[PDB]
């Protein structure tokens, strides 16, 4: 706890942003869990999907 258990290497920072055009050509950044959750909550399921609209 005082010194440490390892050295975490530098990683590209995830961007919250929003699902859309900017996600089409990004081979360097990982999506944020919040954005992935925001986009996937508007998707129908394979079994027992309650479609609306």
């Amino acid at each position: 706890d005082l010194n440490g258990a390892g050295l975490v290497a530098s990683t590209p920072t995830p961007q919250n942003d929003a699902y859309g055009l900017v996600w089409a050509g990004d081979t360097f950044y990982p999506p944020t869990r919040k954005s992935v959750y925001d986009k996937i909550e508007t998707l129908a399921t394979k079994s027992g999907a309650v479609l609306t609209g």
Binding site: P12, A24, D26, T27, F28
Partner: protein
Amino acid sequence: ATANVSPSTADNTLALATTAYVKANLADYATLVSPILTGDPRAVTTSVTDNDTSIATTAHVRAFANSRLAFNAFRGGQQGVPSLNYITTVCQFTSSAVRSGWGDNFSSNRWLVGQGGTYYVSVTCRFATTGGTPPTYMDVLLFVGLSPTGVENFVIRQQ
């Protein structure tokens, strides 16, 4: 001061090693402080983005020198302007290349810069007229911008 006859420096047996023997064997090995590496010294080649006190190999140096080209954008072919009268218009591109691992990206019309810094930018494009009666005069302004209507760096105007 218990002593023994010094064995040969090549001895690899159970015979008792002497201090002079140990020093003679150590004289063949590189010290931590200012070693003189001869022959063909080799190490692990690091990533092109490595920026620390690790030894850089010749392959790493060549790769880093190669990755100096951030991006290249080449449009062959033709496209007509959507509107005249000094309306800022983005020129799209057809083919391109980007350096790998540095985060630079380039889509059909824009370059996402991987790392901020000093960049040597080169631009070239030809304007002509197709169809009808050619106009008697044409004035042209070229800009590199940070937005669809970016006017941050106006570079060349020709008539």
